[PDB]
Design a protein around this ligand. Structure first.
Ligand SMILES: NC(=O)c1ccc[n+]([C@@H]2O[C@H](COP(=O)([O-])OP(=O)(O)OC[C@H]3O[C@@H](n4cnc5c(N)ncnc54)[C@H](OP(=O)(O)O)[C@@H]3O)[C@@H](O)[C@H]2O)c1
Ligand SMILES: Cc1c(S(=O)(=O)c2ccc(=O)[nH]n2)oc2ccc(Cl)cc12
Length: 315
């Protein structure tokens, strides 16, 4: 099935297009091509600095009547410098304005860590540590709930929250809306079994980011493990007459996850969508899971002293 039912009663496409690092002069075409070849879910964020250009593509495809707005599922994320109650609505509205939308399908707290507001996305002290905000995650959640009640967003969720932080939200006094989604890094080298089971047991849908291991991440080191080049994964793909990327995308789908591979290459955008016509066996799935090594693309390494840094915790 192409969509998963969320705890807000809406359905979310299990395959979406990622847009982190998609250059602004390429992302409009990427999103146009994606919609043309079947994608109905785009993963966005203000911090990616390309929402205007994503929006141009969405608006053109709506105008062309390639798709209806109700058939699209557009996700964005509240950046860390906007955790303050009085800044959340304006951050959401800037994203809506850039994406050329009147509502988002899903709006996520991008990270649990709040930073000092201002122009800088990573405000630093003179010694290089990120400068925190005193705003706690629970008050930021209350501000997210208001966006649902104002009609700006259909669903709210979280991203990069560890198990205890998810629990904190679920245990919030006076909680009005549960998170619909927790978007986390997940691939065969970071399989996330504990966090995924917890979220799924609470009815929170998990989205897997960096499913191909983000080979374009800015801090890649040549010695790092490489999913797309792992001969063991290549062998599973060859057995199924699929590409390694197609296996890497199908894998989270069969764990009841949503998955958001990024590409700006038209052929790969189309490739990555052709994952609804084959099945990995249970043995394939367990074999892929066995490759876990707790290896992260995204460890927010500049924020490790923040009180809310998510990755000291086991999960
Ligand atoms: N919530 C968060 O904190 C967070 C963090 C990280 C990522 N995300 C989201 O998750 C999305 C996906 O993660 P990601 O961008 O880190 O990396 P990814 O999707 O794991 O990998 C993207 C890279 O793989 C390449 N690629 C794509 N399809 C390919 C294929 N079929 N064959 C070979 N190479 C292929 C892309 O190249 P080309 O583009 O050159 O084709 C790009 O270099 C992001 O774009 C963003 O939307 C969210
Ligand atoms: C890692 C990391 C990043 S990132 O790598 O810039 C990133 C990448 C992509 C993205 O979508 N979000 N962030 O930002 C953070 C902010 C707070 C914390 Cl605790 C960790 C990080």
């Amino acid at each position: 099935a192409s969509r998963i039912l969320l705890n807000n009663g809406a359905k979310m496409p299990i395959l979406g297009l990622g847009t982190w690092k998609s250059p602004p002069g390429q992302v409009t075409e990427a999103v146009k091509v994606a919609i043309d070849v079947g994608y109905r879910h785009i993963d966005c964020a203000h911090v990616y600095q390309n929402e205007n250009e994503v929006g141009v593509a969405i608006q053109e495809k709506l105008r062309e009547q390639v798709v209806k707005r109700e058939e699209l599922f557009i996700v964005s994320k509240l950046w860390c410098t906007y955790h303050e109650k009085g800044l959340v609505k304006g951050a959401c509205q800037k994203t809506l304005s850039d994406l050329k939308l009147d509502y988002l399908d899903l709006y996520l707290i991008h990270w649990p860590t709040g930073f000092k507001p201002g122009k800088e996305f990573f405000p630093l002290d003179e010694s290089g540590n990120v400068v925190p905000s005193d705003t706690n995650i629970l008050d930021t959640w209350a501000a997210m709930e208001e966006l649902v009640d104002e009609g700006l967003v259909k669903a709210i969720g979280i991203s990069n929250f560890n198990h205890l932080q998810v629990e904190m939200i679920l245990n919030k006094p006076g909680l009005k809306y549960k998170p619909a989604v927790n978007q986390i890094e997940c691939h065969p080298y970071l399989t996330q079994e504990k966090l995924i089971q917890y979220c799924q047991s609470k009815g929170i849908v998990v989205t897997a980011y960096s499913p191909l291991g983000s080979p374009d991440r800015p801090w890649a080191k040549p010695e790092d493990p490489s999913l797309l080049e792992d001969p063991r994964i290549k062998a599973i793909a060859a057995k199924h007459n699929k590409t390694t990327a197609q296996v890497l995308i199908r894998f989270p789908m069969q764990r009841n996850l949503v998955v958001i591979p990024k590409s700006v290459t038209p052929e790969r955008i189309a490739e990555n969508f052709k994952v609804f016509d084959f099945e990995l066996s249970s043995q394939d799935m367990t074999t892929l899971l066995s490759y876990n090594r707790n290896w992260r693309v995204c460890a927010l390494l500049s924020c490790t002293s923040h009180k809310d840094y998510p990755f000291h915790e086991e999960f």
